Amino acid sequence: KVFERCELARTLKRLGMDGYRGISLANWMCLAKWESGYNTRATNYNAGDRSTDYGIFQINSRYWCNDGKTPGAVNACHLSCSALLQGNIADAVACAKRVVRDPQGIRAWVAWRNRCQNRDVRQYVQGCGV
Amino acid sequence: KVFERCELARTLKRLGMDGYRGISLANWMCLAKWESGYNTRATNYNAGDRSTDYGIFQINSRYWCNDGKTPGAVNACHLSCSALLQGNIADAVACAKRVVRDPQGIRAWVAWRNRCQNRDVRQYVQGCGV
Amino acid sequence: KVFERCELARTLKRLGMDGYRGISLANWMCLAKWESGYNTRATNYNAGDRSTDYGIFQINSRYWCNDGKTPGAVNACHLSCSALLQGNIADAVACAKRVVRDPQGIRAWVAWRNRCQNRDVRQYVQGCGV
Amino acid sequence: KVFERCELARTLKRLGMDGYRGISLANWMCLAKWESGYNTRATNYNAGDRSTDYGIFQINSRYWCNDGKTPGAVNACHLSCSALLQGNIADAVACAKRVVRDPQGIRAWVAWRNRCQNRDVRQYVQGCGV
Amino acid sequence: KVFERCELARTLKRLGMDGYRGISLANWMCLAKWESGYNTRATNYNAGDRSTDYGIFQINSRYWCNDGKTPGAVNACHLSCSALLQGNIADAVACAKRVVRDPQGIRAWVAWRNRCQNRDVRQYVQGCGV
Amino acid sequence: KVFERCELARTLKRLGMDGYRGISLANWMCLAKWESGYNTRATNYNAGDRSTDYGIFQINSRYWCNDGKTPGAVNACHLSCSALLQGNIADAVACAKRVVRDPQGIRAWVAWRNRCQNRDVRQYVQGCGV
Amino acid sequence: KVFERCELARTLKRLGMDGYRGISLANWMCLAKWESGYNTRATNYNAGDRSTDYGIFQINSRYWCNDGKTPGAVNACHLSCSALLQGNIADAVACAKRVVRDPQGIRAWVAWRNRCQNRDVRQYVQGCGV
Amino acid sequence: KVFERCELARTLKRLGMDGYRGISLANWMCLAKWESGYNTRATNYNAGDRSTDYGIFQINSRYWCNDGKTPGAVNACHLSCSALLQGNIADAVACAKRVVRDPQGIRAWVAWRNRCQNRDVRQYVQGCGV
Amino acid sequence: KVFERCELARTLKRLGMDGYRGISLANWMCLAKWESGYNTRATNYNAGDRSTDYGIFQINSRYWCNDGKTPGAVNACHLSCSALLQGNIADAVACAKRVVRDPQGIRAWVAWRNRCQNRDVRQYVQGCGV
């Protein structure tokens, strides 16, 4: 028997949660491969009120670029005049007899098992409990 | 028997949750492969009121680019004059005899099993409980 | 027998939930492959009132670009003069004898099983409980 | 026998839920492949009142682009002069002898089984319960 | 026998739900493939009153573009002068001897089974219960 | 029996959580390979109020670049005139007889198992408990 | 029996958590390989209020670069005129008969097991407890 | 029995946590290989209020570079005119008959096991406890 | 029995944590190989308020470089005119019949085990405890 009685108080004006605006979860995972890279800000834990962050506060830019006006026989396969961009330029240009991405192989992800769990995600106010 | 009695109080004016605006969940997962990369801000945990963030607060840009006016025989397969863009430029251009993406292979995802679970996602206020 | 009696109070003016505006769920998943990348903001957990975020607060841009006026024999297969865009430019241009995407393979997703579960998604106020 | 009696109070003025505007669900899933990427904001959990977010607060843009006026023999297969766009430009242009997308393969999704479940999605107020 | 008696109160003025404006559901799923990507805002959980969001608060744009006036032999297969658009430009242009989309393959979705379930979606107020 | 009685107080004016704006989770993982690199800020833990960070506070740039005007026979496979960009330029250009990425191999991810767990993610206020 | 009674006080005006804006988690992991390198700031722990950091406070740059105007037979495979960029330039250019990345090998990730766990992630205020 | 009674005080005005803006976690790991190098600032522990750091406070740069105007037969495979960049230039250029990265070998990551754990991540205020 | 009673005080006005903005963790690891080198600042422990650090306070640079204008037969495989860069230039250029990186070997990471742990990460204020 976890407890005979609670007997918390002889008087009380309230018990419980007012204005609960919180967001709760159990975002745990069980996998074989994760790719979360290629970002401009990442995994930064900032505790405290009135936090602030800026990628670029101010940029007074004037800009000229020329990838053209080329009178030559062959200009090909080229990324050029890229600028003022906040983010990732990935696999931008490819020139090939054959291009492939992520071929999944022969019998390459077979018979893999997961047995992962949690008991509860609970936010509560109780006079006595277990 | 978890408890003989609750006997919490001799007087009370309320018990429970007022104005509950919270969002609860159990977003746990069981998988073999996850790809969540290629972002401009990611996995940043900011505790505290009045938090603020800006990707680019101000940019007074003037800009000229030329990828044309080319009198040459062949200009081909090229990303050019990209600019002022916040995000990801992926697989932008391809020139090939054959192009493929994600071929799924021969017997490449067979007989894989998952047995994953949770008990509850519960936000509550109770006088006594188990 | 979980409990003989509740006997919470001798007097009470209310018990329960007023103005419950919350959104509850069990968004758990069991799968083999997830692709959630290529975003401009992602997985950012901001606790606290009066939070604010801006992708670009202000941009006073003047802009000139030319991908034309080309008197040459062949200008082809090219992404050009892209600008002021917040988001993802993916697989923008392809030039090939053959183009394919996501071929699903031979016997490539066969006999895979899932056995995943949860017990409850419950927001409640009760005097005594189990 | 979970409980002999509830005996919660000798007096009460109410028990239950007033003004319940909440949205409840069990959005759990069991699958083999999920693709939720290519977004401009994603998976951002913002707890707290008076939250605000802007993709672009202000943009005073002046803009000139030219992809034409080309007197050359062949200008072809090209994305050009894209601008001021918030979202995703995917598979925008293709030039090929053959174009295919998502061929589903030979015996490529056969005999796969799911056995996934939940017990309840319940928001309630009860004096005593199990 | 779950309980001998409820005996909740000696006096009561109400029991039940007034003004219930909530929306309840069991949106759980069991499938093999889901594609929910290509959005401009996604999976953002905002708890708290007076939340606000804007895609673009203000844009004072002036704009000139020219994809024409081309005196050349052949201008073809091209997306051009796209602008001020919030959303997705997908598979915009195709030029080919043959174009296909989603061919469903030979015996490619055969004998797949689902056995998924829930017990209840219930919002209730009861004096005692099980 | 964890406790005979709680007997916390003879008088009380409240017990519980007011204005809970916190975000709780169990983001633990069990995997074989993780790639979270290629960022511009990462894993920075900043405790304390009024924290601030800037990627570039101010940049008054004037800029000229030329990758064109080339009268030579063949200019090819080149990234050029990249500038003023905050983020990652990955696999930007490829020129090959064949290009492949992430081939998944023969029997290369087979029979791998996970058995990982947690008991609870719980934020609560209780007079006595276990 | 962990305790006979709590008997904390004869009078009290409150017990619990007000304005909890904290973010809690159990981000522990069990894996075989992690790659978190290639960043511009990393693993910096700054305790104390009013912390500040700048990547580049001010840069008054004037800039000229030329990778063109080349009248020679073959200019190829080259990254050039890169500048004013805060982040990572990885695998920028490749010229080859064959290009591959991350081939996954033969039987190269087979029968690997994880058995990792935690008991709780709990932030709470209780009069007496275990 | 860990304690007969708490008997903390005869009077009290509060017990618990106000304004908790802290971020707690258990980020422990169990693996075989970690690569966290190639950064511009790393593992710097700065205790104390009003901390500040700058990568480059001020740079008044004027700059001219030329990698072109080359009339020679073959200029190839070269990184040139890189400048004013804060971050990592990795694997920038490759010229080869074959290029490979991270081949995963034959039976090279097989039967490896992890059995790692923690008991709790708990921030709390309690009158008496164990 | 760890203690008969706490009997801390006859009067008290508060007990607990106000304004807790701290960030706690258990970042312990168990592995076989770690590579955290190649940085511009590292492992610097600075105790005390008002700490400051600068990579380069001021640089008034004027700069001219030429890697071009080469009329010779073959100029190849060369990093040139690199400048004003704060960070790491790694594996910048490669010219070879074959290039490989990190081949994982034959049976080279097999049967390795970890059994590492911690008991708690706890920040708390309690009248008496164990």
Numbering used by the authors:
A (entry chain E), B (entry chain F), C (entry chain G), D (entry chain H), E (entry chain I), F (entry chain D), ...: 1 to 130
List sentences quoted exactly from the publication behind this structure.
Lysozyme is an important component of the innate immune system that helps to neutralize pathogenic microbes. Natively folded lysozyme possesses a compact, globular structure and has been the archetype example of a protein from the α + β class of protein folds. The protein contains two domains, an α-domain with mainly α-helical conformation and a β-domain containing mainly β-sheet structure. Systemic ALys amyloidosis is a debilitating protein misfolding disease that arises from the formation of amyloid fibrils from C-type lysozyme.
